[PDB]
Amino acid sequence: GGQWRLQQGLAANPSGYGPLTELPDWSYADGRPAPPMKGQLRRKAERETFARRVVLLSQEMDAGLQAWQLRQQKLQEEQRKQENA
Amino acid sequence: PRFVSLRAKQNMIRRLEIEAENHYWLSMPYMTREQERGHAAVRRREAFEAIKAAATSKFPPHRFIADQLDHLNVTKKWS
Amino acid sequence: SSFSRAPQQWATFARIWYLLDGKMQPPGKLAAMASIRLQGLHKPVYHALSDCGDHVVIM
Amino acid sequence: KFTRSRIPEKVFQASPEDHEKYGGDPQNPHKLHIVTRIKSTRRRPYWEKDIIKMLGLEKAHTPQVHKNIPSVNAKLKVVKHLIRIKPLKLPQGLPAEENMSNTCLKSTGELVVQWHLKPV
Amino acid sequence: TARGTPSRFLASVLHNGLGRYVQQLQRLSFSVSRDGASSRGAREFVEREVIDFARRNPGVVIYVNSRPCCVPRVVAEYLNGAVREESIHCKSVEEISTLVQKLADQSGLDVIRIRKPFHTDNPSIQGQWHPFTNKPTTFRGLRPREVQ
Amino acid sequence: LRNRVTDRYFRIQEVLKHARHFRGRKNRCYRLAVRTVIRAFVKCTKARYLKKKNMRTLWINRITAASQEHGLKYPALIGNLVKCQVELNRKVLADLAIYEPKTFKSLAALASRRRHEGFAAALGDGKEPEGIFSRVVQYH
Amino acid sequence: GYVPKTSLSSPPWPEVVLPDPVEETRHHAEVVKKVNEMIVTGQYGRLFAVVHFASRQWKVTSEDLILIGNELDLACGERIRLEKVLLVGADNFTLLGKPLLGKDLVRVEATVIEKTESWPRIIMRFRKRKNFKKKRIVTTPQTVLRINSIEIAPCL
Amino acid sequence: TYSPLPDDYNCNVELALTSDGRTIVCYHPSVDIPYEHTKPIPREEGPMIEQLSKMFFTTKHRWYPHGRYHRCRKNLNPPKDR
Ligand SMILES: [Mg+2]
């Protein structure tokens, strides 16, 4: 029953993101935290490269529009500075 | 002869609904085609110069004295 | 709980006689209830090889 | 003969009814798409197989970020029956280098830049 | 296959974690040729690793025999009287170290098929299901079509 | 014969230790034992998929039976336990059904209570207070 | 809007009237107080936890064994607190979390007994008339855990 | 007066949330059988296979023997558990 979980903003599969799969399964009995799970390290690597891609594409879009606005402003300056003499 | 159940119609329909929303989100680009031009030419060129560079840097590995002599250890014995 | 091993095992797999009055009833809708209780598919202890069917008396 | 299909432009023009249906604004549109493959390239022509490989959607049910520019939209229009597109919405900002590791893309379509595992 | 092989249930030796933990590995018996190309990695294991290993677990008594063998062996004996003879023939020191630590970490029970992945000895707490759980009783214990 | 094969008893015996429990001459005659032994190993690996499948249908049979004891049906129980954020799985629910039937009765009570709040909530539509067991715990 | 009582006038299911949330939240407070008194005064006997160790849910009492299909990279003998317990039951009460219980509520301990390998496990592929026959033999690593104790705490 | 199941036969189920709304407390003590709901304690191969069939309500086939090949494949020391 995962369409319900999509209604609530959860992962459609309870083995997705969230507290069942991302907290560590075990600790030491002293209370020392375990070394991290292999799948959680892998998964954090995937999420980080995804975030880097979001930032990278966003910045290329913004730099793209700024460079276009310089080309338009300099076209208009080349219009007004050639209507003289 | 094969006939169409309610499962098949409801499945077909939910695919049609995903499709219609794909039509919606493709109807409003962030840039025009004039604005996007060359906005990523540098990164594409550097990426291909990396592909090109890994292609043209292919050569036999270094050979070492220590490996060849290290084969002598197959008759290491005790005393 | 706190039974011995043998009477616990006897209690779990014991089979139960059910009565089922079929007056003014359809035979397939009787047959479904009867079939479930004959295979033991109404028990959570069910398994095919474990042989846990019951008796159904239809009058 | 089975050929490659052009799709007319009236198909990709939203109506205000659709702006009431989905959550979109025609002014100030979204920058990034999330694309997911939800259908197989098997039994599909080789050009659609290729476009799926270019967009980086070889694995199904795995989201991919794209730009909402007309080039990427052209490739998406070719394989729009195999994918799902949602806008990448960002409730907080795009992640800085401090919040780069601690992100999570949720199911809603939003990308949260602080992902604790505590209840609110 | 499973129908060809014997199987067993998941067990310990003497309830091995309840009270205290006991290393189930009693003896190792290395036999290593002095001059011989197959027991090279055994030789470098006795010289480098066997003293450290022998100190990391003192409940294990280790015998290095060093006769002219043509294949070197290790013979693990366990507290429940099982004997696992494995060869260390043409193995590196690292491969022998992982094998010896493998023999240390395990118990003497067979590595045949294990039927269930778990073993409770008290599986039920609220009382196991019998067909009169989840059934109501009647007044005076009557059954259907019972007159008085 | 310059070099003919000496070590052939052991190749045969590598196959035939797997066939010792067949019937007929498949247990002894290498030519027959090879076809049956191969075929046994192929079944042995395709049976991992069916082991997983058949356990799951076995659990659905046991949860179905145990939940029919409390009047619920299986879709009602599983659905309305997901909706309580009780993400127990089928193996555990079947084992609770057999070994802990009060916990299973209380889970059936929690699932039918949630089911009724689903009914009453989706009947009196509009802005209203949500159900008590209907509330969800947001994780951030 | 009256309909006279026919077969199909009303729906066939009987109407349930769920209780009002004032008396119901008060009633819950009474129940949680009762059960918290049973946890304080130690009324319970032995517990069973459902624990989400590794990738699957283990139903677990004290003094038992779990065989896990991977090397945990712990020494034999090390005690472990299993987090992610998601049901805890006694004879007269249970406690079930949404989806996990509080770490301050339940504590499940387990030691590592042994770190074995599996029995050798065949992987054969064969397609007819194609000369297609591969064979592989796999042994997965395994560790056995002994659940020592399920301790419960009065934090309701 | 609401009961989500007829708390009559196995245990008296009493559900609860806590104030945080994070754990569901179930309380379920056992239902004892009443004294009023109880009764006081009262104080040849062919025909033999038909007689056993009719006695144990099974068919006839499991009373015929089986050959040596099947009697010797049987595991007489099978693994025990619990
Ligand atoms: Mg399946």
Residues in E closer than 8 angstroms to H79, CB to CB, are 7-9, 115
Q: Are strands C17-20 and C55-58 parallel, antiparallel or unpaired?
A: parallel
Residues 6+ apart with CB under 8 A from G83: A23, A24, A25, A26, A27, G100, G103
Number of domains forming the structure of chain A: 1
Q: Domain limits of chain E?
A: 1-148
For residue G113, give the H/E element and its range: strand G106-117
H helix or E strand, kind and range, residue D38? none
Residue H31 contacts F, CB cutoff 8 Å? no
Nearest Cα neighbor of D83 from D57, D107, D46, D65 is D57
Query: Could you tell me how many helices (H) and strands (E) chain B has, helices first?
Result: 3, 0
CA of F54 to the centre of ligand 1 (A): 9
Q: Which chains touch B (3 or more CB pairs under 8 A)?
A: A, D, E
Q: Are A8 and F136 in contact (CB under 8 A)?
A: yes
Nearest CA in chain F to A18: F139
Peptide bond into G4 cis (omega under 30): no
Which contiguous run of DSSP H or E holds residue E102?
helix E93-105
| Parallel, antiparallel or unpaired: strands G106-117 and G141-152 | antiparallel
Q: Is F47 on the interface with C (CB under 8 A)?
A: no
CB-based contact, G82 to chain A, within 8 Å: yes
F70–H13 C-beta distance less than 8 A = no
C-alpha distances in angstroms, G138 versus D120, F45, G126, G135, G141? 45, 11, 17, 10, 10
Experimental method: cryo-EM
Token pair 């069917």 is at which residue? C53
* D63 interfaces chain B, CB cutoff of 8 Å: no
Instruction: Quote the tokens at residue H30.
Output: 């056992």
Closest CA to B25 of D87, E26, F4: D87
Q: How many CB pairs under 8 A join A and F?
A: 13
Distance of CA C46 from the midpoint of ligand 1 (Å): 20
| D18, B24 contact by CB (below 8 A) | yes
In what helix (H) or strand (E) does residue F57 lie, and over which residues does it extend? Answer: helix F30-68
Residue G33 has phi, psi (to 5 degrees) of -65, -40
Contact H2 G18 (CB under 8 A): yes
Contact H9 E135 (CB under 8 A): yes
- A12 Cβ neighbours under 8 A, 6+ residues apart: A2, A3, A5, A6, D107
Lay out the sheet containing G48-51: strands in order across: G58-61, G48-51, G85-89, G93-97, H23-27, H14-17
Choose from F60, F84, F138, F139 for mutation: most chain A CBs within 10 A.
F139
Bridge partner list, G95? G88, H25
Residues 6+ apart with CB under 8 A from E28: E60, E61, E62, E63, E74, E75, E76, E77, E100, E103
Residue in B closest to E34 by C-alpha: B78
What is the DSSP secondary structure assignment for residue F129, as one 8-state letter? P
Chains touching chain H, criterion 3+ CB pairs below 8 Å: E, F, G
Q: Are strands G106-117 and G79-82 parallel, antiparallel or unpaired?
A: antiparallel
For A41, name the nearest residue in chain D, comparing CA atoms only: D101
* Cα G22 to Cα E102, G26, G29, H13, distances in angstroms: 62, 6, 11, 20
In sign, the C-alpha dihedral spanning B16, B22, B28, B33 is negative
Mutate to test the interface with F, among E7, E116, E129 (most CBs of F within 10 A): E129
Domain boundaries, chain D: 1-117
In this complex, which of G31, G91, G98 lies closest to H14 when CB atoms are compared?
G31
> What CATH class does E1-148 carry?
alpha beta
> What's the gap in Å between C52 CA and the centre of ligand 1?
26
Give the Å distances, CA to CA, from A3 to C9, D21, F79, F89: 42, 19, 11, 17
F55: region left, alpha or beta (phi > 0 left; psi from -120 to 50 alpha): alpha
> Beta-carbon neighbour count of residue A54 at 10 Å?
22
Out of C42, C44, C47, closest to residue F97 by CB: C44
Radius of gyration of chain E (CA): 26
Contact D13/B36, CB-based, under 8 Å?
no
Residue H18 CA to residue G29 CA, distance in Å, equals: 7
Helix/strand/coil (H, E, C) string of G20-63?
CHHHHHHHHHHHHHHHHHHHHCCCCCCCEEEECCCCCCEEEECC
Chain centroid offset of residue F52 CA = 5
Please name the chains neighbouring E, where neighbouring means 3+ C-beta pairs under 8 angstroms: B, C, F, G, H
Neighbours of H65 (CB within 10 A): 7
- Picking from G17, G35, G91, the nearest residue to H25 by CB comes out as G35
Alpha-carbon distance G140 to G54, whole Å?
Answer: 15
Q: Residues G73, G74, G75, G80: what is their CA dihedral angle, to the nearest 10 degrees?
A: -160
User: Which among E119, E134, E138 has the least Cβ separation from residue H10?
Assistant: E134
- Which residues in chain C are contacts of F68 at CB distance < 8 A? 42
| D41-45 contacts, C-beta under 8 A, 24 or more apart | D41/D82, D44/D82, D45/D2, D45/D4
Residues on chain F touching G134 (C-beta within 8 angstroms)? none
Contact at CB, E130 and C14, closer than 8 angstroms: yes
- C-alpha to C-alpha distance for E48 and E92, rounded to whole angstroms: 12
C11/E130 Cα distance (integer angstroms): 6
In this structure, what are the phi and psi dihedrals at residue E127, rounded to the nearest 5 degrees? 95, 120
Residues in a beta bridge with E114 = E8
Q: Give the minimum alpha-carbon distance from E36 to chain B in angstroms, rounded to a whole number.
A: 7
| Residue that the structure tokens 């006694």 belong to | G90
Q: Do C42 and F63 touch (CB under 8 A)?
A: no
Give the C-alpha separation, D25 to D27, whole Å. Answer: 5
**CA nearest to F97 within chain E:** E129
Nearest 5°: the CA angle D82, D83, D85 is 155
What one-character DSSP code corresponds to residue B43? H
Identity of the residue in F70, F109, F137 whose CB atom sits nearest the CB atom of H15: F109
Burial class of residue C5 in the structure, from the number of CB atoms within 10 Å of its CB (0-12 exposed, 13-18 middle, 19+ buried): exposed
Are H6 and G14 spatial neighbours (Cβ–Cβ below 8 Å)? Answer: no
In angstroms, what is the span from residue A15 Cα to ligand 1's centroid?
15
d(CA D26, CA D15): 10
| Whether G54 contacts chain A with CB within 8 A | yes
- Answer whether D12 sits within 8 Å of B27, measured CB to CB: yes
B78: left (phi over 0), alpha (psi -120 to 50) or beta: beta
User: H9 vs E141: CB contact, 8 Å cut-off?
Assistant: no
Enter the DSSP assignment of H33.
P
φ/ψ of G61, rounded to 5, equals: -115, -175
* Residue span of the structural domain in which A9 resides: 1-85
For chain C, say whether E144 makes contact (Cβ under 8 Å): yes
Distance CA(G87)–CA(G96), nearest Å, equals 5
Total number of domains in chain F: 1
G87 closest CA partner among H12, H69, F87, E143: F87
A1 in contact with F, Cβ within 8 Å: yes
Chain A partners within 8 Å of B31 (Cβ):
61, 64-65
F9 interfacial to chain A (CB closer than 8 Å): no
Q: Is A4 on the interface with F (CB under 8 A)?
A: yes
